Amino acid sequence: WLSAASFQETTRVLTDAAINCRSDKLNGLKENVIIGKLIPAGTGINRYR
């Protein structure tokens, strides 16, 4: 819901997520940018870090 709420239609996605009790695993570029972590690409992946 974090990646879809910042694209379009915030109210609808937030309402559906609230009803369904969804969980976000924070495993994308946008979510890691939003919360302030290293993106999983380039030099931020486990082999190079």
Partner 1 sequence: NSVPGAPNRVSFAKLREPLEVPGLLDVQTDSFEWLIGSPRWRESAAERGDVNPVGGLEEVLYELSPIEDFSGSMSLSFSDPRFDDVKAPVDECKDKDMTYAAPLFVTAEFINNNTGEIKSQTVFMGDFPMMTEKGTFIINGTERVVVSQLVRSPGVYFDETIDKSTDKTLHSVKVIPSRGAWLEFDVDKRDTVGVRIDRKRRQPVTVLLKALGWTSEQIVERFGFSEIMRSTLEKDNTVGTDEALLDIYRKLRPGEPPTKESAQTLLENLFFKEKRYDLARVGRYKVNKKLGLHVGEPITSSTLTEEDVVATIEYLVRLHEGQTTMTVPGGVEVPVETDDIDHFGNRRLRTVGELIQNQIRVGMSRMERVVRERMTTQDVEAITPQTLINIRPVVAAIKEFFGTSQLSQFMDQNNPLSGLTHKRRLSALGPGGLSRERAGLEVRDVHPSHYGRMCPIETPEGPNIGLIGSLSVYARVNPFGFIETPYRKVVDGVVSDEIVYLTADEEDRHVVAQANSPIDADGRFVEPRVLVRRKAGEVEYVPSSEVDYMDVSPRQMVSVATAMIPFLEHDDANRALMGANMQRQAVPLVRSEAPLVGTGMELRAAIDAGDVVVAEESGVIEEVSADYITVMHDNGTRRTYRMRKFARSNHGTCANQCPIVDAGDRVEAGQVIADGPCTDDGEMALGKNLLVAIMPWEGHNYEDAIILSNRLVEEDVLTSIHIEEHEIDARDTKLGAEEITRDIPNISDEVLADLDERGIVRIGAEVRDGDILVGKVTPKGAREVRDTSLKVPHGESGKVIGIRVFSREDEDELPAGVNELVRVYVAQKRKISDGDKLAGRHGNKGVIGKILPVEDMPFLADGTPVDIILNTHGVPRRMNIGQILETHLGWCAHSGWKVDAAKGVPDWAARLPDELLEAQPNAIVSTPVFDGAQEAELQGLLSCTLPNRDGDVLVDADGKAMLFDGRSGEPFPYPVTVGYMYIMKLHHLVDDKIHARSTGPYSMITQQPLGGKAQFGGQRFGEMECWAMQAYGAAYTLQELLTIKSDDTVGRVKVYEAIVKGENIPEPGIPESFKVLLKELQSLCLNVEVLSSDGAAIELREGE
Partner 2 sequence: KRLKVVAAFQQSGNSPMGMVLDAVPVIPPELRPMVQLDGGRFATSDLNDLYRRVINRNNRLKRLIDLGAPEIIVNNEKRMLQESVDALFDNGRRGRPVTGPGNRPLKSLSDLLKGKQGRFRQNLLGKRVDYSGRSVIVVGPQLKLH
Partner 3 sequence: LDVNFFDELRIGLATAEDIRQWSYGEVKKPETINYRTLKPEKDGLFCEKIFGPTRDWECYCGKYKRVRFKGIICERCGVEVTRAKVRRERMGHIELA
Partner DNA sequence: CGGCAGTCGCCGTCTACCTCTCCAAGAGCAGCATGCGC
Partner DNA sequence: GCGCATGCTGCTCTTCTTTGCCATCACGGCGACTGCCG
Q: Which residues bind partner 3 (CB under 8 A)?
A: 1-2, 14, 17-19, 21-26, 35-37
Q: Is 39 in the site for partner 1 (CB under 8 A)?
A: yes
What are phi and psi for residue 46, nearest 5 degrees?
A: -65, -40
- With contacts defined by CB under 7 A, name the span among 4-12, 21-29, 30-38, 41-49 that binds DNA: 4-12
Contact at 8 Å (CB) between 47 and 38?
A: no
Measured CA to CA, the distance from residue 11 to residue 26 in angstroms comes to: 21
Which parts of this chain interact with partner 1 (CB under 8 A)? 14, 18, 23, 29, 33-39, 41-44
